[PDB]
Amino acid sequence: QQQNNLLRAIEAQQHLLQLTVWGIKQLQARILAVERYLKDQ
Amino acid sequence: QQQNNLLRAIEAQQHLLQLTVWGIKQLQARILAVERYLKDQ
């Protein structure tokens, strides 16, 4: 029982990690666009 | 022993994940505010 709960927890945590990676990539693109905008201005 | 260490590791990792989510949310709000500022300017 303890083992299956741990496996399920890691599975869900990997989904969480994947969402945080998505977020970070979005933010990186957006800050880069702002930096370039200001440079181009 | 191996099992309790793994459970404790996941527990701590979930705390880490929660901190990264906090950070990403903060950053998203801040970049959005900057984007809107520049648009309003």
């Binding site: 303890q2 741990l6 869900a12 | 099992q3 459970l7 994940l17």
Partner: peptide, 27 residues
């Protein structure tokens, strides 16, 4: 994917993990 959906899914997975970890605290 949107930020509103991002927040929803984050919350879903977090609550599931909490339940799983607790349910294991009761080894």
């Amino acid at each position: 994917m949107t930020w509103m959906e991002w927040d929803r899914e984050i919350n879903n997975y977090t609550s599931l993990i909490h339940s799983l970890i607790e349910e294991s605290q009761n080894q």
